[PDB]
């Protein structure tokens, strides 16, 4: 995780029930950016032809 | 593949016809084939060697 600088206050209803308001600096500094890796495979599967 | 007679029939350019022939070549013959191309595996062995 990361040490975010939080503030506890309502803000125009954008954190109404369980929603969060995040500054653009968080996106700019590439916090919470994540790398994902997938696997794709193919087989030859020889035939009678 | 009688290119010489093709030349003397068409009155067409010498070795400048090659790119036109290549254009004809790159024209996807048999176009309906590419709608589905799945082919299965049908193999049954009677004798095994390892």
Swiss-Prot record, chain A:
Signal peptide: none
Modifications made to the protein after synthesis: Acetylated on several lysine residues in the presence of glucose.
Domain of life: Bacteria
Outcome when changing residue 17 to K: Disrupts the enzyme's active center
Biotechnology: Co-administration of salinamide and rifampicin or salinamide and myxopyronin suppresses the emergence of resistance to both antibiotics.
Subunit: The RNAP catalytic core consists of 2 alpha, 1 beta, 1 beta' and 1 omega subunit. When a sigma factor is associated with the core the holoenzyme is formed, which can initiate transcription. The rRNA transcription and antitermination complex (rrnTAC) consists of RNAP, NusA, NusB, NusE (rpsJ), NusG, SubB, ribosomal protein S4, DNA and precursor rRNA; S4 is more flexible than other subunits. In pull-down experiments interacts with CedA.
Family of the protein in this entry: Belongs to the RNA polymerase beta chain family.
General function of this protein: DNA-dependent RNA polymerase (RNAP) catalyzes the transcription of DNA into RNA using the four ribonucleoside triphosphates as substrates.
Protein name, UniProt field: DNA-directed RNA polymerase subunit beta
Species of origin: Escherichia coli (strain K12)
Lineage of producing organism: Bacteria, Pseudomonadati, Pseudomonadota, Gammaproteobacteria, Enterobacterales
Section covered of the full-length record: 797 to 845 of 1342
């Amino acid at each position: 995780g990361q040490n975010m600088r939080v503030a506890f206050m309502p803000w125009n209803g954008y954190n109404f029930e369980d929603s969060i308001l995040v500054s653009e600096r968080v996106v700019q500094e590439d916090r919470f950016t994540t790398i994902h890796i997938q696997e794709l495979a193919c087989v030859s599967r020889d035939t009678k032809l | 593949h009688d290119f010489r007679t093709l030349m003397r029939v068409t009155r067409l350019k010498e070795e400048v016809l090659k790119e036109a022939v290549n254009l004809i070549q790159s024209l996807d013959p048999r176009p309906g084939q590419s709608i589905q191309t799945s082919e299965p595996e049908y193999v049954i062995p009677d004798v095994l060697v390892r």
